[PDB]
Design a protein around this ligand. Structure first.
Ligand code: GTP
Ligand code: GDP
Ligand code: GDP
Ligand code: MG
Lengths: 430, 430, 48, 430
């Protein structure tokens, strides 16, 4: 009687949704056709006899990815008319997907959301995935969040956004729409998790020893993180954690809800079994700055609160004995007004392996969600990138001619300045 | 006659009860199907204390299970001895509290509590002669620490002359699993002192310390901590269910261990406890039991009892033994430690003997002592509370559901006043 | 300094409390009456 | 001796009777072929109450079935126990009323009623000593609420000294299946108060609430509501067909439950009612029966009985039990709830004991209480009536068959006067 609905918008969102939906189907024993040859209820729904239907909706204005989905092996799984598709792409223009073509599509998505919600009885909250540096992704994510915040109100929404890397970039105009989308979801999303690609590339290179990774390898790690986060809702555990038990433990103030994640262990089968993978060493590896899932240095800032999930055969006393060691270290310092900052969850189900993938099978794993003061650097560098081109009003004509006003750029800049001032104000000791 | 009903709330309380009832059933020879298969006549004479009688000759506990989420009770039913509980007594909500005290005490816990109070009233009105209630809950969680404490006040308002027990687990700063523990601990201690006739604090840190040092087992789990807590719980009411040289119900302990109505926070301990490999070396004698009973590491709390002076003490011996030896040993443990006993109340140790030992053991002792050393726990809890509250961290979650900071200030002031007036008698001299 | 800090804001909330208490005191004192219903009922019963 | 005849009208009444007669036949061991196959001697001693004797040794109910359309009686004949009914007693028209009260009471119901009155007179003149009549019909339909109530007046005009029962289903505003329900409900209540010696209101909403909450069965159907109504119907006349400690016919209940001739609208309830999975947990005792008997949710009406004060109450216990326990429990249920019992009539609960329990149950109770809380149903019915009548909506259908608005005004005024004078005694004091 506990449910959650995941929203996938944009090319990156759909490509990570595919990645998480192989993993969930594999973890619950459901074949790609949707047929089994009481834990499924969190992500799926029973049709009365036979197949299961995911509680997910796919959105995009550009039809190529959806058409690829509707012809692959998973054509029989998803309901045919929840893969909403458009005709014309926003083409990396934020104003297009927020004012011009997204408005005519958003009504169908909201109707689908209502039709899925009326089925659930214990709706925990929503999940949303969107790559920020694109037109349709950021614009439609903003519009959907704004509609949901007023249609439903206090229901919790979680956002797994992928911000651009510090120096590596695929587009040339992504700072503009990244800043605008951050403006939009700052006052509209309860949790936002950092996911830039460069850090995960470094993780793959160093640990998985892959020298030529593709997007699928990144999306599989993200899917594993999602599964670790939501395992506690569908498996028995000695110390459970619910989604609603987050803003009471990781969010000191309503404005501050951007945090960065990490995962451990990450290791290949060729050298995994030569070492014992004790809980102490994995919880040490999880706190290593080089294993952050976002390219930010935690040594440059304080910690505010750490929520970290275990799964497997871990014993609570071993967890406490390792939290003490971390509190001992002099290179990790917490904020003054937080004496204890750890929330611990323990689950019994070990992580599942996907055949043909990178990760091996292990009995212990740890996933941490940590809120730290050091996150302000990404905001500062994105702001610096934005200012350089906004000084000469470059690329603005592509946005003014799509219905957006001239002054809309300035207030996003002011909100980022306010956020950066707030992060500095919080981190000073009393 | 003089029976009590069981009420438990939250996940921690449900897990404690899931072992407490197993221990009681094994003691009385009740199979997991509710059928008596015991050996001794005394096993059935006073079974009305905890068990009711139904048609078909089976027995059903008079326990009431409540939580704001259905998962824990849906899991405890599948465990051993899970079928004994009457399905009608299961009451649950569909939302949960998310470790937020305000949600579990003002908004959600207020509407649901009518249904559980209905079954509580049904159970109490029916029974032959009420002795009282015993409550198991945790102070580290939202729904538990809120709904349980509000239920305490509601029960006290309707049965002012009955006795009330509470076994409360307080969050230690060593093993912290939730970041918002100080808030709902401090808020709960405020209400708990006003209504509970007896309170018994239990700490996970002390349980891990005991398991690692005395039993010396490699991998402690929640099952061992629950088993120790269950043995301690059963030891208190043993003489009320079995004959003995000096019977002593709960009210007699209440008279003899509480000097002033606001000083009713005890810490307990169980003896004997020996490792598997050393269970053959030791010989069970009254001196061996009493030397381990007053041992500082044997207390179920991290509070150090030689950092203060005992106001009073109690011991509940089990098994057949001579009373002269018990009295002389109690005198000896009080003459050799005169510095740690307050001097203006002479003969401050109570003893009782029950002729029925635990199954598998020939002698056992349960210790309940009211000491001034408990101040250290409230001191550190208030220290963390005032470290976190001065910045108003995580305050918006509580203030968004009708609560204000004034109730936080009053709670802090009352808790500090309790801390001060509890140590006031430590320096008092005759 | 810290123990010194421990006093002033709490005194100001109590004064605010005095005015609130004054209104309840007044409120309790206001009283009014219910005799009219009794008179009316006395009238209602007489007709019955 | 002192037997009664059965008369039913409309579709709802026919469906109620189709289960009432099945229940009676199963109680007396009569096969669907009319052949006795019972086990106990008492099953045949008082069979003349409901069944007649014909050649060949078979038994035939003295029931009269009437409707303005032939479909329902053509359908009830093919059901189980449908062959018992004498084909001669089936009377029907070829047109129907179409849920129009005027058509079923002035134009069509007036011409047909002579034939059914002929067979009614044949049945009553013949029987040994008449006790009275019992009527089952619905107030939400046209033909039923018209022809049944006119037949009530015609029967009362010819047998003024006999007793008359009516089991009336009134249209609740929650589950509404007909838009013209208020008109024919208000018109019928006007005539029903003037002639019926007893009236028992039953609501479909309360039956659904009971089925969903107490029995906890997933999919209620009309068969379950009919079964509950049939059990309640059979419980009233049980002691008239079986020996007991204190026999009490219908006239004795009429004397003791009606203080003033116009206050004869009761609401009933049946106990025990338990789910299939909990039928083994519960133990049947007099306290368990009496606590469920006075439960507010157990009433067969949505009216809330703690919103008013009982003028009087009645209970018809079944099975072999001690009278001292029954009397002391009745006293206890009246001392603990003195606020909900009117004070100027002391000892306002009637009890009766019958030694023959229902087949399959060891104890059963039927509750009939006259309470002031019934005013709420007439209040809402009149509210809907005056909301619809002020615009003269759907009035032309009624006014086209000789009826006028004056009879609507008089009916509304009389119903409001009944509502007022029923609550007049609620505020009365000694
Ligand atoms: N992690 C990850 N990021 C991706 C992936 N695909 C695209 N991105 C990121 O998404 C950004 C651009 O947005 P896209 O998702 O590609 O396109 P869009 O969101 O649909 O917006 P449009 O261009 O209007 O179609 C790029 O800067 C990429 O870094 C992916 O498969 N995995
Ligand atoms: N002894 C024991 N303690 C437990 C168990 N499960 C959780 N706890 C403790 O309970 C605390 C969390 O309480 P929580 O589950 O949030 O209570 P709730 O909010 O009422 O559900 C943790 O600090 C644990 O130490 C258990 O099985 N046994
Ligand atoms: N208990 C019960 N109620 C019924 C059944 N069928 C219909 N009803 C109720 O009867 C009402 C309609 O009455 P109707 O059939 O028009 O009566 P008629 O005009 O005399 O035929 C509806 O509101 C239903 O709630 C049944 O099988 N059982
Ligand atoms: Mg695209």
């Amino acid at each position: 009687m506990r449910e959650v609905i995941s929203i996938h918008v944009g090319q990156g969102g759909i490509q990570v949704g595919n990645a998480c939906w192989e993993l969930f189907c594999l973890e619950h024993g459901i074949q790609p056709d949707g047929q089994m040859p009481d834990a499924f209820n969190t992500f799926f729904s029973e049709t009365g006899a036979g197949k299961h239907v995911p509680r997910a909706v796919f959105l995009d204005l550009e039809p190529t990815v959806i058409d690829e989905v509707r012809t692959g092996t998973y054509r029989q799984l998803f309901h045919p008319e929840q893969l909403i598709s458009g005709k014309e792409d926003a083409a990396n223009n934020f104003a297009r997907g927020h004012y011009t073509i997204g408005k005519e599509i958003v009504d169908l998505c909201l109707d689908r959301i209502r039709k899925l919600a009326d089925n659930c009885t214990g709706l925990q909250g929503f999940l949303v995935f969107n790559s920020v540096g694109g037109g349709t992704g950021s614009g439609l994510g903003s519009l959907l969040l704004e509609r949901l915040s007023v249609d439903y109100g206090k229901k919790s929404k979680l956002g797994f956004t992928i911000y651009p890397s510090p120096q590596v970039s695929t587009a040339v105009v992504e700072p503009y729409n990244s800043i605008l989308s951050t403006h939009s979801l700052l006052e509209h999303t309860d949790v936002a998790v950092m996911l830039d690609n460069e850090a995960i590339y470094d993780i793959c290179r160093r640990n998985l020893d892959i020298e030529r990774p593709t997007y699928t390898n990144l999306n599989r790690l993200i899917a594993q993180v999602i599964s670790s986060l939501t395992a506690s809702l569908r498996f028995d555990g000695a110390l459970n954690v619910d989604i609603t038990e987050f803003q009471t433990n990781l969010v000191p103030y309503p404005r501050i809800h951007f945090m960065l994640s990490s995962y451990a262990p990450i290791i290949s089968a060729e050298k995994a079994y030569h070492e014992q993978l004790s809980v102490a060493e994995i919880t040490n590896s999880a706190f290593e700055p080089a294993n952050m899932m976002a390219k930010c240095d935690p040594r440059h800032g304080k910690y505010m609160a750490c929520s970290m999930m275990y799964r497997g055969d871990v014993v609570p006393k071993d967890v406490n004995a390792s939290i003490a060691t971390i509190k001992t270290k002099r290179t990790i310092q917490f904020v003054d007004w937080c004496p204890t900052g750890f929330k611990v969850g323990i689950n019994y189900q070990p992580p599942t392996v996907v055949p043909g993938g990178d990760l091996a099978k292990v009995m212990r794993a740890v996933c941490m969600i940590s809120n730290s003061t050091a996150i302000a650097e990404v905001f500062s560098r994105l702001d610096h990138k934005f200012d350089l081109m906004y000084a000469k009003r470059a690329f603005v004509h592509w946005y003014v001619g799509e219905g957006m006003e001239e002054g809309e750029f300035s207030e996003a800049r002011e909100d980022l300045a306010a956020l950066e001032k707030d992060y500095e104000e919080v981190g000073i000791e009393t | 006659m003089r029976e009590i009903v069981h009420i438990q709330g939250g996940q921690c309380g449900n897990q404690i009860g899931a072992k407490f009832w197993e221990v009681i059933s094994d003691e009385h020879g009740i199979d997991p199907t509710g059928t008596y298969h015991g050996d001794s006549d005394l096993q059935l004479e006073r079974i009305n204390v905890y068990y009711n009688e139904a048609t078909g000759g089976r027995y059903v506990p008079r326990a009431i299970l409540m939580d704001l989420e259905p998962g824990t009770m849906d899991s405890v039913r599948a465990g051993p001895f899970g079928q004994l509980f009457r399905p009608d007594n299961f009451v649950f909500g569909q939302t949960g509290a998310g470790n937020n005290w305000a949600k579990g005490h003002y908004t959600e816990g207020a509407e649901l509590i009518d249904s559980v109070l209905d079954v509580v009233r049904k159970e109490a009105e029916g029974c032959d002669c009420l002795q009282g209630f015993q409550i198991t809950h945790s102070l580290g969680g939202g729904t538990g620490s809120g709904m349980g404490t509000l239920l305490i006040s509601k029960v006290r308002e309707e049965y002012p002359d009955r006795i009330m027990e509470t076994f409360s687990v307080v969050p230690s700063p060593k093993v912290s699993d939730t970041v918002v523990e100080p808030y709902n601990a401090t808020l709960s201690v405020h209400q708990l002192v006003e209504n509970a006739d007896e309170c018994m604090v239990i700490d996970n840190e002390a349980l891990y310390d005991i398991c690692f040092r005395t039993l010396k087992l490699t991998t402690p789990t929640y099952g061992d901590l629950n088993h120790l807590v269950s043995a301690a719980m059963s030891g208190v009411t043993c003489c009320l269910r079995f004959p003995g040289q000096l019977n002593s119900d709960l009210r007699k302990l209440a008279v003899n261990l509480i000097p002033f109505p606001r000083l009713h926070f005890f810490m307990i301990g169980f003896a004997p406890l020996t490792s598997r490999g050393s269970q053959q070396y030791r010989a069970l004698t009254v001196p061996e039991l009493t030397q381990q009973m007053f041992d500082a590491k044997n207390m179920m709390c991290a509070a150090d009892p030689r950092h203060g002076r005992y106001l009073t003490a109690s011991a509940l011996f089990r098994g057949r033994m001579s009373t002269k030896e018990v009295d002389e040993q109690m005198l000896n443990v009080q003459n050799k430690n005169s510095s740690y006993f307050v001097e203006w109340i002479p003969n401050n140790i109570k003893s009782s003997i029950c002729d029925i030992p635990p199954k598998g053991l020939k002698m056992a002792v349960t210790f309940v002592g009211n000491s001034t050393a408990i101040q250290e726990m409230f001191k550190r809890v208030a220290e963390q509370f005032t470290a976190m509250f001065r910045r108003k961290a995580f305050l918006h979650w509580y203030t968004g559901e009708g609560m204000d900071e004034m109730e936080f200030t009053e709670a802090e002031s009352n808790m500090n006043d309790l801390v001060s007036e509890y140590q006031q008698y430590q320096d008092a001299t005759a | 300094w810290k123990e010194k800090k421990e006093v002033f804001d709490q005194q100001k909330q109590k004064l605010i409390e005095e005015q609130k208490k004054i209104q309840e005191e007044q409120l309790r004192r206001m009283q009014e009456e219910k005799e009219k219903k009794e008179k009316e009922f006395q009238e209602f019963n007489k007709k019955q």
